[PDB]
Amino acid sequence: SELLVNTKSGKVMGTRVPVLSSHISAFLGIPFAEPPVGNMRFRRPEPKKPWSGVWNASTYPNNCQQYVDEQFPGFSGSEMWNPNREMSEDCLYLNIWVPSPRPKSTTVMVWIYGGGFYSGSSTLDVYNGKYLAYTEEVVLVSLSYRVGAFGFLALHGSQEAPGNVGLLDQRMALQWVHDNIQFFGGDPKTVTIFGESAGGASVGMHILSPGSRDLFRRAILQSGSPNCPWASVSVAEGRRRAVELGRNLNCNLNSDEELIHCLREKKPQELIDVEWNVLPFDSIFRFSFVPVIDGEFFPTSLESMLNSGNFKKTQILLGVNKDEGSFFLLYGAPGFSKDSESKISREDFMSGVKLSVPHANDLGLDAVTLQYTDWMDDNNGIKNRDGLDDIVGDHNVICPLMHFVNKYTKFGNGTYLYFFNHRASNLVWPEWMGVIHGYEIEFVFGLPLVKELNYTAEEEALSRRIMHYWATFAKTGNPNEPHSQESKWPLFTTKEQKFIDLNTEPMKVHQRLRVQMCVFWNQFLPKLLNAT
Amino acid sequence: SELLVNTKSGKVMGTRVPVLSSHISAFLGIPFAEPPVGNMRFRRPEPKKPWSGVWNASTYPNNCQQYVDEQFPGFSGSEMWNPNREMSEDCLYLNIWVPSPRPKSTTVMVWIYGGGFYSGSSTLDVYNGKYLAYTEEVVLVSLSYRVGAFGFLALHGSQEAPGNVGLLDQRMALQWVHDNIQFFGGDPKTVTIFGESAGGASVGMHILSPGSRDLFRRAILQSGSPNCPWASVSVAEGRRRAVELGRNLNCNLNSDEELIHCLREKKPQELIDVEWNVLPFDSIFRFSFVPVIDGEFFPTSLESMLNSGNFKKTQILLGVNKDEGSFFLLYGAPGFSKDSESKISREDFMSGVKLSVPHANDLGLDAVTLQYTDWMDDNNGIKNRDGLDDIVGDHNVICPLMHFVNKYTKFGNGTYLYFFNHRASNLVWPEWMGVIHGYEIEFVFGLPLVKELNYTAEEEALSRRIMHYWATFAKTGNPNEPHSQESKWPLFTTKEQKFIDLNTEPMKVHQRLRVQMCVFWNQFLPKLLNAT
Numbered sequence A, B: 001s002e003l004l005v006n007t008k009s010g011k012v013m014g015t016r017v018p019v020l021s022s023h024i025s026a027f028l029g030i031p032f033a034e035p036p037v038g039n040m041r042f043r044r045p046e047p048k049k050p051w052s053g054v055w056n057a058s059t060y061p062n063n064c065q066q067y068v069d070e071q072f073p074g075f076s077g078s079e080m081w082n083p084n085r086e087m088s089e090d091c092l093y094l095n096i097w098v099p100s101p102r103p104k105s106t107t108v109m110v111w112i113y114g115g116g117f118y119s120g121s122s123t124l125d126v127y128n129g130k131y132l133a134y135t136e137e138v139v140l141v142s143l144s145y146r147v148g149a150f151g152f153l154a155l156h157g158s159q160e161a162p163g164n165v166g167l168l169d170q171r172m173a174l175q176w177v178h179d180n181i182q183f184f185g186g187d188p189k190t191v192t193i194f195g196e197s198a199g200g201a202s203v204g205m206h207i208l209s210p211g212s213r214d215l216f217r218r219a220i221l222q223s224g225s226p227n228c229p230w231a232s233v234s235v236a237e238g239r240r241r242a243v244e245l246g247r248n249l250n251c252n253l254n255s256d257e258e259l260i261h262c263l264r265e266k267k268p269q270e271l272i273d274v275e276w277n278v279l280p281f282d283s284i285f286r287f288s289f290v291p292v293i294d295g296e297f298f299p300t301s302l303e304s305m306l307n308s309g310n311f312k313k314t315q316i317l318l319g320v321n322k323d324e325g326s327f328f329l330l331y332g333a334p335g336f337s338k339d340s341e342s343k344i345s346r347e348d349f350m351s352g353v354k355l356s357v358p359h360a361n362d363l364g365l366d367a368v369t370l371q372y373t374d375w376m377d378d379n380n381g382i383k384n385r386d387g388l389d390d391i392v393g394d395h396n397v398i399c400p401l402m403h404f405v406n407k408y409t410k411f412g413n414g415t416y417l418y419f420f421n422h423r424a425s426n427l428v429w430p431e432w433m434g435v436i437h438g439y440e441i442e443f444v445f446g447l448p449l450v451k452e453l454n455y456t457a458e459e460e461a462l463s464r465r466i467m468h469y470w471a472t473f474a475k476t477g478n479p480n481e482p483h484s485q486e487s488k489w490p491l492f493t494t495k496e497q498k499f500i501d502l503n504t505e506p507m508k509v510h511q512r513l514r515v516q517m518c519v520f521w522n523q524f525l526p527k528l529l530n531a532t
């Protein structure tokens, strides 16, 4: 029937879900790998072995084992990001929304969640695929992957804990879509991968990785790129943190095998409790277990690959939010509070930039401070707050992304760049936090289309316009409908470097997104640190 | 007799000069030292031996030997600064303007000319003392001093060419005023020294040097300060340049005595012809022979003296012009012309910063370039022109002075700071050059009171305001007359750092003169250049 689909691995039975006074098909919790448990902890994923009978794909899967945020208990602004299903190492599943009736060979979009590579679930309310799948008539997949040590513990040289297995989980899920999505009405030749933060970085890493390039058509990157400073580590640093993880848990450290055997004996939560203890610095926007530049998933350094054009050549559509940094200041920097304006003293500012740029020498910290301090007014608590906000955002998200876009556009076949700066009317976070990291996601998934969610009429229109941009781009490689009286989102080009605002107001075109600060972050600071 | 005066060195006869429909006494070209000729070239000055009979002090003396600017033959804009008298090494004279009838014991101001320590004359039209002396009823002295190699050849250790002898010439003229000025109606206890550019640096150097402090009461510094990057050199560098001077003249370089003897045998013009060839780099706003940090005239480093409060504690009044840099770009940097808007290409902007900051390494050049470039609009010839203008002025004049004023005020007895930003109605230079280095001088000396010079009525008013500020400061240590009705020029204080604009409009008070850039020039850049 329509809800019963035979895949190369066995039969699965979906369920009929409502969506905005209508219905579509949903196949939830489809297994794409063998449970990476016991002796398979830290190991590359193995394809799911075929099953007899009918897989009950009627409900969401378990979430992967991860740090859970208990900073603000009962608070929806933080808890909406926490696992809303049981956590288990048995977590390699994907979800699929198929429009009803089932289309023939339609555009496919595959969502990859963010969460700093240490967290994230495919099952969050804001990742509910039904609205975008319905509205834009696309087949929408959300995958999952191992996070934290389970996904990114790297002991380079070992085949038992090689590193990057979380990215390989993602690849295996893509490979699965390639092989089976036709049976769901999806065109395997027109798959768009897209994701936010760590998910956006992930999408770009698959653009770079030879082993992933043939498993998708184009890419959307939201608030993340593969070259972000928090997104990868060297094999040496991966190993250092892996060894230090052992030390924290009183493991044998004589050899990888002994270290790994010991770590495989520990309950999941034991690992998580000490996860953050392996970071080299007091820091914000830094995460312990992340992709390693290993010479295998990544042939060489990310920079040289971008320089030599060694990467998938296709259309990309990508962008950032206005205040990427504020979330992370809230959690790790002095003077910030969810419940106040968070006017920042001069002392707390100094402390902040040190946390934000953990790896800089004193000269580097002075350079950053100078660049973001108004010396006619240096005791302005507000300017100090917003400056720290800009620093965290520019350095971790916006300028790394701009570096990527400029390198990619030299070789790619089309670039569309956006700047999302709408502040949602129903936000539960304080005003000072602005347009927060992650909060364009609810618009991309069409949450504003839901009456009871109490968005404004113009917010619903924005969501629809954004969904159409995303879906239309996925279908054709161009967010603009070829017809259309409506205004046009211009190509980003090496010379003119155009981008658009995304907000409730009529579209404006600008050029050179934060070029001043990004010259500092991308050219001058790196040269300063290397010289001193 | 009003014009006949007996000094400690001998009798002197002045001339009666008209001034603005009245008259005053002038004593022109009084000798204060032995001619620094023959075997006394490069030597410390010696007091003028007493003479018999009456010195005719009715005409200006010769100007010291110096480079003559022939860039723009016939052009008053550059020629007003060249020697208007025959040049001679026999040039250590001073001039005095005395109110008629002779004051009993009135305020004295002593003018020290600028000219980068390589040029200058006491006899320039724009230094004519009669207008200020007459209008404000002060005894005005203008001294002279050896410039270029003749004044500042430094071979530390040698007693034949010790260095700083031009500063000692200044001191000797000050000592003369101390000893003789009472005979002219002046109070040797209320002497203000004032000077512009090199003259302003000089003044600050007398504030610092123990040997000078007791020879004056207060100080005015215009567009120059002792700590300017062009205003001094180390004994090592001063030696290198002295030795390089000999090499450029085929001199015996084996010893100081031989080198010196060779150099004493050359015509003045031979020295001058090769003067510029000893500079370390291609540069603008750099001069070959300047004060040395010797351990004698300056006991220790200028910075350590400023830090320890090792200097004269008195009142100062100092300031800068809006476009200090423009004169120097015109002469040395590519793309600048007296007869065009001088829109500067990006390539010429790069060339300009390198010329402007010749000691910086590549990291430093990048820093400067970043700090003065609008990267949304880097090919704007205007912003590039003005940017380079600001670079030269901030680095060479404004920020050195701001460092001095901040350091000094922590110990001094009163600081008044100004920002001169009036472009004169009858300027012969192009508009792009703005408010030029040196062009507040004609206001301080009251030229706009001369109706034939065709200044506006409001420019005459401005001049009168400025002359009254300078003179009232000279008399009392405060440019303001309390009990008066006019706007008050506030003290510069460590906390509030207030300063005023000098122009034709109602007074405005501002705070933190160019803080942002001067933090860069005074704190950040030196830290960057010191690391490797």
Ligand SMILES: COc1c(C(=O)CCC2CCN(Cc3ccccc3)CC2)cc(Cl)c2[nH]ccc12
Pocket (backbone or CB within 6 Å): A069, A078, A081, A114, A115, A116, A120, A196, A197, A276, A283, A284, A285, A286, A327, A328, A331, A332, A437, A438
């Ligand atoms: C600075 O490093 C940290 C963090 C963070 O990284 C920030 C916390 C929030 C970062 C955004 N999350 C929401 C989100 C999720 C997926 C995509 C987009 C947004 C929620 C938590 C947290 C904790 Cl608990 C830390 N403990 C020590 C150090 C540290």
Ligand SMILES: COc1c(C(=O)CCC2CCN(Cc3ccccc3)CC2)cc(Cl)c2[nH]ccc12
Pocket (backbone or CB within 6 Å): B069, B071, B081, B114, B115, B116, B197, B276, B283, B284, B285, B286, B327, B328, B331, B332, B437, B438
């Ligand atoms: C011919 O001069 C130079 C320079 C200069 O720095 C010239 C700029 C001055 C030109 C006339 N001055 C007028 C003035 C005098 C007293 C107070 C205020 C303003 C001041 C700026 C540099 C180099 Cl590298 C040169 N090489 C040969 C020759 C020459």
Ligand SMILES: *[C@@H]1O[C@H](CO)[C@@H](O)[C@H](O)[C@H]1NC(C)=O
Pocket (backbone or CB within 6 Å): A056, A058, A059
């Ligand atoms: C699938 O699971 C849900 C509950 O987990 C159950 O209600 C439903 O009946 C199951 N489907 C089948 C075919 O057993």
Ligand SMILES: *[C@@H]1O[C@H](CO)[C@@H](O)[C@H](O)[C@H]1NC(C)=O
Pocket (backbone or CB within 6 Å): A412, A413, A414, A415
């Ligand atoms: C994409 O490729 C086609 C064919 O190679 C080319 O004609 C087109 O100009 C390219 N588009 C962009 C935006 O680079």
Ligand SMILES: *[C@@H]1O[C@H](CO)[C@@H](O)[C@H](O)[C@H]1NC(C)=O
Pocket (backbone or CB within 6 Å): B056, B058, B059
């Ligand atoms: C002094 O010099 C002036 C100017 O040359 C001259 O006119 C005057 O006669 C001279 N005075 C005496 C007493 O020689």
Ligand SMILES: *[C@@H]1O[C@H](CO)[C@@H](O)[C@H](O)[C@H]1NC(C)=O
Pocket (backbone or CB within 6 Å): B412, B413, B414, B415
């Ligand atoms: C200057 O010094 C005098 C003498 O002690 C003192 O009374 C006065 O307060 C000082 N003024 C300033 C502005 O420092």
